[PDB]
Amino acid sequence: PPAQLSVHTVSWNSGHERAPTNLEELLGLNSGETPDVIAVAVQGFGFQTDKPQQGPACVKNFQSLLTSKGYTKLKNTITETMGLTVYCLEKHLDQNTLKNETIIVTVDDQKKSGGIVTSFTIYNKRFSFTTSRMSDEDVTSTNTKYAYDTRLDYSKKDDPSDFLFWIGDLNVRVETNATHAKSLVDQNNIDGLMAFDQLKKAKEQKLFDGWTEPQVTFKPTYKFKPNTDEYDLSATPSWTDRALYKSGTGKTIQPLSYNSLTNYKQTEHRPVLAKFRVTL
Ligand code: HEM
Numbered sequence: 001p002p003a004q005l006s007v008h009t010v011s012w013n014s015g016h017e018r019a020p021t022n023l024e025e026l027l028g029l030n031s032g033e034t035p036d037v038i039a040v041a042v043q044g045f046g047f048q049t050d051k052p053q054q055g056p057a058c059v060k061n062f063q064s065l066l067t068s069k070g071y072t073k074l075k076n077t078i079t080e081t082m083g084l085t086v087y088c089l090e091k092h093l094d095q096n097t098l099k100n101e102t103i104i105v106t107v108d109d110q111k112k113s114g115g116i117v118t119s120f121t122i123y124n125k126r127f128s129f130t131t132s133r134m135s136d137e138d139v140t141s142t143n144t145k146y147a148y149d150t151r152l153d154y155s156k157k158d159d160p161s162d163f164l165f166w167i168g169d170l171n172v173r174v175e176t177n178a179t180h181a182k183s184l185v186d187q188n189n190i191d192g193l194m195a196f197d198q199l200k201k202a203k204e205q206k207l208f209d210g211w212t213e214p215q216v217t218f219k220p221t222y223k224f225k226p227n228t229d230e231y232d233l234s235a236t237p238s239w240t241d242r243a244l245y246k247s248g249t250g251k252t253i254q255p256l257s258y259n260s261l262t263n264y265k266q267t268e269h270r271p272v273l274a275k276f277r278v279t280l
Contacts (some may be wrong), residue, residue, distance in 0.1 A: 001123040004279050005092075006256075011041035011131065011241045012264075012271035013169040013222070018054045023065050025263060028273050034069065035275070039118075040129035041167040042083040051082065075102050077116045082168070084116040084131045092122045099126075105151045113138055115152040115168075119161060124280050125251070128154040130159040131168040143243065146198070147171045148207040151224060155210060160248020162254070163278050166211060169269070172198040173238040174220065181236045185219050193220070197239060211244040214255035214274060221260045221270040243274035252279040 008028045012223040024030045027038055041064075046052075062085070063073070071087040078084075099121050107115040115132030134140065134147035141149055147170045154161045174181055176196040184193040193217060202208050220237035224230065231237050241260075245253045264271050 004277050005036040007037045007276045008035040009039045009165055009167045009243050010166040010271055010273045013043045013240050013269040015044045017267050019058050020162055028275055036089050039129045041102055043081060043133050043169050046080060047078040047083050054068055074100055074120055075118045077102050081112050082116055082131055082133050084118055086118045086129050093196040097121055105149055107140060117152055123280055126161040127163045130166040131138060134171040145171050146202045146207055155246050155248045162249045162251050163253060164246045166244040169240045170242050174236050178233045178236045179201045183235060185237055190217055211246050213242060213244050214258035218260040223268050226267055227265055240269050241272040
């Protein structure tokens with residue numbers, strides 16, 4: 001069994017938009033890296049039913065790029081508002097110990113908010129990937145707007161997973177006015193604007209307890225005028241798509257890079273790509 005494995009994650013609050021043609025950039029494969037595990041999370045509208053019939057292009061296009069690099073799709077899960085797919089290189093899998101398992105958590109009677117957790121074991125180490133989705137208006141188990149539920153947190157099991165990732169738009173925003181936020185963006189004072197970000201507030205309320213976000217050096221990923229790099233200042237610029245990590249068992253998880261993908265500009269939010277090296 002290997003000393004270390006690499007994991008790439010991407011999430012995007014893509015809304016109504018279809019999957020795009022250059023997936024190598026999206027998955028962080030454009031400089032020839034070969035991650036052991038890839039997870040892709042989307043938030044948007046109407047996936048499961050699929051009235052635009054983009055399901056088949058999703059499958060066609062992802063399966064065509066990834067199967068020829070040695071990936072097996074462990075699971076794709078879709079709801080009306082979320083999608084989560086996890087891929088792993090074929091060479092790591094053993095059917096007798098993989099114990100591939102997904103749950104879906106619903107918090108409302110329309111099944112629009114909640115999350116997905118997909119877990120599996122390779123080399124006797126358990127990985128869990130979560131995505132989640134919450135509305136501002138929702139009544140919730142936390143009495144906050146944040147996309148946390150303890151059922152989605154596999155570090156709060158009696159037998160916590162070894163490597164945990166939570167990816168998606170957490171419904172965490174920047175709590176200041178648009179003018180001040182845009183001034184801090186224009187000055188590139190990322191840490192100054194992050195001071196107003198709600199993740200620390202969620203953690204003060206004991207949500208996302210013990211979860212770490214890699215250092216953010218990129219500008220807010222929302223809200224943009226589509227096809228441009230111009231902020232739509234009808235919303236305070238915020239960091240929407242996030243990647244969080246933790247270990248339940250004291251394993252080292254080292255972020256290598258964490259960045260927004262500004263070249264993908266076709267919508268209001270920009271995708272966020274994180275790359276990690278984990279030590280077994
Ligand atoms: C641009 C954002 C999107 C991304 C990144 C994305 C990503 C993915 C991924 C990675 C898969 C699994 C592919 C595989 O089989 O290996 C998938 C499946 C699927 N996607 Fe998307 N998707 C997007 C947009 C959409 C939209 C707008 C719809 C329509 C509502 C949609 C509908 C579906 C459906 C129905 C499946 C499952 C189809 C099947 O299992 O036959 N996707 N998507």
